[PDB]
Assembly symmetry: C3
Homo-oligomer: 397 residues x 3
């Protein structure tokens, strides 16, 4: 039992390094906490964690495009719809269970139109080159930050258009498969930088009562949905140990607990499922890019608790529907999850000005929130893969 320890210290050496970086990140951060938290000084200390995010976000653009293009071309007309329906039924339910449990824990223990239009404006981009670095935000009208929604949508219909012309449109698919493979080699390179980054990402961010109880409500709620409810969903589908599957994607969850972005961690998550858990590439390039942008189970729970927590200052159907709708939401400027807090409160009738209270604790919750967002699509991949046994068998020979 205590003899086979060295065989684990050599195998998962980097997995121990990113864990030790989480340990040392708490160490160095609290060590430099008594010193002044000057804006420049903080941003200079949080620079090796900043460099990591630049390498990580540069890799997502040629990843999501090449993923969905080959992902839909390598699937039949009915096979693409089937795999999709299996994923959507999973996405909607996992964002509906997290909101239900999220509403229970808080009730037991404790322009809006222009947003709909901008999302629709972003689903159909006016320019593709622009979409690769610009999103639409009304009131000039194009804000900085890649329009992932417009790219995901275009990549799907373009990829499916290739999968409908076959022989002619094989060249482009063979181009996008080599490009997806090249960025999957680049992710193995940037993988080694992760410990040095995850350290300064959480070391630099810790140098920044009534909220005390709220913090535990969400944290425990996320543990019940993520480490209790979600593994039971996997066992109800595959009948395989999920706590061994989750172990394989640890390097992606540990980084999610640092980066706080399912986007920044999607290339590592892609490697953790294609290499460690050995999931079929045909479904990773399909489920993972969509899942990271739409399936946000960690967000659904946090949006529900925050809406009822501010009600203490002062019709659950108007809150449960909006919090599930906020999870699919990715409009305007890219943020930490506070970008959609105005929309979730206006539709019900709660005070919008009560947001400044939760922002002080939000940053530590964001790290746990992202872990569930990644765990949602990660476990979801196995569930969709197991449910698409016929579709994946027919593709070979």
């Amino acid at each position: 039992t205590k003899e086979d320890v060295k065989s684990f210290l050599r195998r998962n050496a980097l997995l121990l390094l990113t864990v030790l970086a989480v340990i040392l990140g708490v160490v160095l951060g609290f060590l430099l906490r008594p010193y002044p938290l000057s804006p420049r000084e903080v941003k200079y200390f949080a620079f090796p964690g900043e460099l990591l995010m630049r390498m990580l976000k540069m890799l997502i653009l040629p990843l999501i495009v090449s993923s969905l293009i080959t992902g839909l071309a390598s699937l039949d007309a009915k096979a693409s719809g089937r795999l999709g329906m299996r994923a959507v039924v999973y996405y909607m339910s996992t964002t509906i269970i997290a909101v239900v449990l999220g509403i229970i824990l808080v009730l037991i223990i404790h322009e809006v139109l222009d947003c709909f239009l901008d999302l629709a404006r972003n689903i159909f981009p006016s320019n593709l080159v622009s979409a690769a670095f610009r999103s639409y935000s009304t009131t000039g009208q194009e804000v900085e930050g890649m329009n992932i929604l417009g790219l995901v949508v275009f990549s799907m219909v373009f990829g499916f258009a290739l999968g409908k012309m076959g022989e002619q449109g094989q060249l482009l698919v063979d181009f996008f498969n080599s490009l997806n493979e090249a960025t999957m080699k680049l992710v193995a390179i940037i993988m080694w930088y992760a410990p040095l980054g995850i350290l300064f990402l959480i070391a630099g961010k810790i140098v920044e009562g009534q909220l005390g109880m709220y913090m535990v409500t969400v944290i425990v709620g996320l543990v019940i949905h993520g480490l209790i409810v979600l593994p039971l969903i996997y066992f109800l589908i595959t009948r395989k140990n999920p706590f061994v599957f989750i172990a394989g994607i640890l390097q992606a969850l540990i980084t999610a607990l640092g980066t706080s972005s399912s986007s920044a961690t999607l290339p590592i998550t892609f490697k953790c499922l294609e290499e460690n858990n050995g999931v079929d590439k045909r479904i990773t390039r399909f489920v993972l890019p969509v899942g990271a942008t739409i399936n946000m189970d960690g967000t659904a729970l946090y949006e529900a608790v925050a809406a009822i927590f501010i009600a203490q200052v002062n019709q659950i159907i108007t809150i449960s529907i909006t919090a599930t709708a906020a999870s699919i939401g990715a409009a305007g400027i890219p943020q930490a999850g506070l970008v959609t807090m105005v929309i979730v409160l206006t539709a019900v009738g709660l005070p919008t000005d009560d947001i400044t209270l939760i922002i002080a604790v939000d940053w530590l919750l964001d790290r746990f929130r992202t872990m569930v967002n990644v765990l949602g699509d990660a476990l979801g991949a196995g569930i969709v893969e197991h449910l698409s046994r016929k579709e994946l068998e027919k593709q070979d020979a």
Copy 2:
């Protein structure tokens, strides 16, 4: 005669739908006209027509690039110059007849240097990625809106550079031919959205004497050049019925009567000539992208009438040359045709401040103006195709 009606209701079902959308567009627009024409309210009603333009303009960038690249590579050194000379002699004459007839109807019934330099600055782009979403406008110096001129020029010399290296540069040509085909599948998809868009595009834009007579001068002038002069040019070249050819490209003219942009309609025009009229792809990818940006017969007529109409408030050679030069013009910010009205009046000596009069009626004229711009290159394609009998025969085997 009245028995073969159902065989037309099933065949050209979408062509009847876009016509009925033009009918219902007049219906719903005038129905909601008594109500307040509030800025937000109008822009929200004109949203399903707005979404259409986003899908349409996203498709032009990978269309014009792939069109001209394969279009010049699939043609010999002399064959490219020949086909080109046939198109230029046609372009210059169709913009010279429309100005002559345009000058007759109005005379019978009724910095400028920095603009030349910006056009030249835009012919040779400083950066290609920039050119895909930015144009040059002096006084920071790069305005939003794709530099079509710089793309058309580069696409030609890049495509011809591939057509000069052959075997080596075949791979890229085979890539750009699959990409042109993929966006031609995407246009068939967006084709079905057109009725729902063309409805709200003209329904939302109708909720917005001396000019009364001017409006008819241009409208009748356009009918004489477009539906009388232009079909006679086609009959003088092909000796085939043009009123059957124009019927094939109806779905592109009906949309031009809505979108008001030969750019937005170029992907539909590409489908209407490659699928309905059965024109050779080798000349569509050649003539159509250039024709939509340079051959503007509807503009030449409107620029001539507007210049002499403002003279009523108060040397035809100084007006006839500038109005033909305004048609080739595509500099600065993309507009509705009023962007070049300062240039056409300064060179002759007419009052520039008299522009605010015609802008109120310009929007309805723009819809008819574009129809002639599309009809110019559409009929032009057949004429060039028929004139390049030897060049297209030698290319096979």
Copy 3:
């Protein structure tokens, strides 16, 4: 001797034309010098030289990307490191000899932290499409002008990732080799415009004591390092006549003496080495893109003289290290070499406000400064090619 003159007037006809353009450029410039040097008037006269720079800079982006991608894929794991180590040992020494000689001639005859971070932020781009037209400059935070550093770095690791997957990643390499060849055909086209441009580039820029002696210090210093020291380095490696090699790349040096940018001239330099001097493409696509951005021997000499020249108004180790570090420097906004003058003086302790003195003469020195920057990598190519005899032999069959 005087009989074989016509055989040179027909062969190097364009090389005589660009030389005659340098002659006529001095002629027309001084002819129009008595007239008013109005801002607009100057910019309109310097327009045919302006058009040249637009064609030249549009060609660098698809050149450097395709160059380094095929350049590292067509080399073995150790072969890439070897060729690289040979180039780096050459780069660092040529920037160390130019600073040493630069420090001798001037001493015989006569936030800074935010700059380090921005360079590191630019080495790892956050977005690739952005990197193709945007650089990082702190205090919104992304300035206009292609991030060459981030492109050079990415192009290397992406190209090497293809060279590690072989057969799979051969398609993309065969794509990038056809694209590098296409822009090498486009450079032969733009080559003919060079005389008409180089004329108005130096004709328009000449219409714009204590500094008199400083001007000669640098000019003579550059001649000693470039036309005396550098050819001796080539003879110490190849044992071949360098004054015949330099003659082949004349059309690239003559243009450098006009454009004043090693970027703008890199496509011509690429043609002058691949066509005239007959250097192996395998090392041109390797050494040249890097060399133009990092190896700046003309800058190292000018940075050293300017730092000690301003000391006349008032520890050489603090000046010699910074001037060598300024040569590798390419951060923020693209300039004429004055962008790094604040950094080189703050680290030592010299007055930063004394910059406004040398800017009046800097423009004529810049033209000679660039010639050494181009001559550095041009001669460097031959030296690396000769030093990589084994690596280039093993690549064939």
